[PDB]
Amino acid sequence: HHWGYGKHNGPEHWHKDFPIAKGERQSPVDIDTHTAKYDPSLKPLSVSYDQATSLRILNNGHAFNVEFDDSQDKAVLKGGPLDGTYRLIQFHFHWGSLDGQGSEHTVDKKKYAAELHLVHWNTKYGDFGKAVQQPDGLAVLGIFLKVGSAKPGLQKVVDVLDSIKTKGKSADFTNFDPRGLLPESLDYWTYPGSLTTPPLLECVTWIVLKEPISVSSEQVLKFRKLNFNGEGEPEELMVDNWRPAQPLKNRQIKASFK
Numbered sequence: 134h135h136w137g138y139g140k141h142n143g144p145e146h147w148h149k150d151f152p153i154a155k156g157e158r159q160s161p162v163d164i165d166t167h168t169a170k171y172d173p174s175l176k177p178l179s180v181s182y183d184q185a186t187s188l189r190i191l192n193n194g195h196a197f198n199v200e201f202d203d204s205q206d207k208a209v210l211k212g213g214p215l216d217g218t219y220r221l222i223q224f225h226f227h228w229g230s231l232d233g234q235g236s237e238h239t240v241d242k243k244k245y246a247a248e249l250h251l252v253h254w255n256t257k258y259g260d261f262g263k264a265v266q267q268p269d270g271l272a273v274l275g276i277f278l279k280v281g282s283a284k285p286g287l288q289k290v291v292d293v294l295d296s297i298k299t300k301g302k303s304a305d306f307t308n309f310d311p312r313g314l315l316p317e318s319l320d321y322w323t324y325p326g327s328l329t330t331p332p333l334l335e336c337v338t339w340i341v342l343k344e345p346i347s348v349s350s351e352q353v354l355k356f357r358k359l360n361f362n363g364e365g366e367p368e369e370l371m372v373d374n375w376r377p378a379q380p381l382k383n384r385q386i387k388a389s390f391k
């Protein structure tokens with residue numbers, strides 16, 4: 134039926150309706166730190182999120198997305214392995230039912246409690262729709278979340294989760310500053326990949342940050358109270374909405390640090 138993360142419609146079944154699931158540049162992948170190549174030609178990332186305009190937060194049945202106004206160059210990602218300007222359109226997370234799992238990407242097989250994805254599209258393509266038809270159409274900034282001290286900047290997100298508990302629900306979510314979700318260091322690993330959820334399009338340049346951000350146990354607990362189901366349907370907790378690591382195949386993971 135429609136794709137999900139359950140036993141009968143999960144990642145292992147996606148290939149039936151989306152053959153690209155078994156493609157050549159699928160994400161996420163395991164990042165082997167000893168095989169990753171330090172590339173001195175990689176420029177530092179340039180995250181310019183000061184003019185960011187968040188609009189709303191929505192439970193889409195797979196995760197919750199915080200959407201941004203991308204009609205202009207308000208919040209952009211440049212530099213790093215990218216050529217051109219990429220506009221922030223939305224961010225979301227993937228998390229587990231327990232603290233020891235939840236991230237999509239892993240580092241030396243280590244799984245983190247969750248993973249934040251800041252989605253950006255290449256402006257030379259005009260709109261998000263055209264960008265997903267190009268090999269360099271998207272750039273997703275990935276950040277790992279480990280359970281420890283609370284992250285102040287994530288609280289506004291946590292507090293609003295009650296209003297979007299079920300699939301289809303949305304709430305206004307203006308003036309959110311995404312800079313509060315960034316770690317201190319912008320060191321990263323980068324490799325060409327895909328969306329981690331159907332349609333699994335291979336249009337993404339992944340930029341995974343080395344330094345994870347820490348959030349509290351209470352903060353992550355709030356994520357786990359969301360529902361995959363719509364209002365009135367039987368309750369299915371939204372947990373474990375992550376895709377397991379895929380074969381790296383003919384790709385090399387480059388590091389911006391040594």
Ligand SMILES: NS(=O)(=O)c1ccc(C(=O)NCc2cccc(F)c2F)cc1
Binds near residue numbers: 327328330332334
């Ligand atoms: N987890 S992740 O960062 O890799 C990821 C990022 C974006 C999307 C997305 O935009 N999906 C909807 C979608 C996809 C293609 C075309 C569309 F029109 C559309 F709405 C999905 C997964």
Ligand SMILES: [Hg+2]
Binds near residue numbers: 265270337
């Ligand atoms: Hg593509």
Ligand SMILES: [Zn+2]
Binds near residue numbers: 225226227250329
């Ligand atoms: Zn994602």
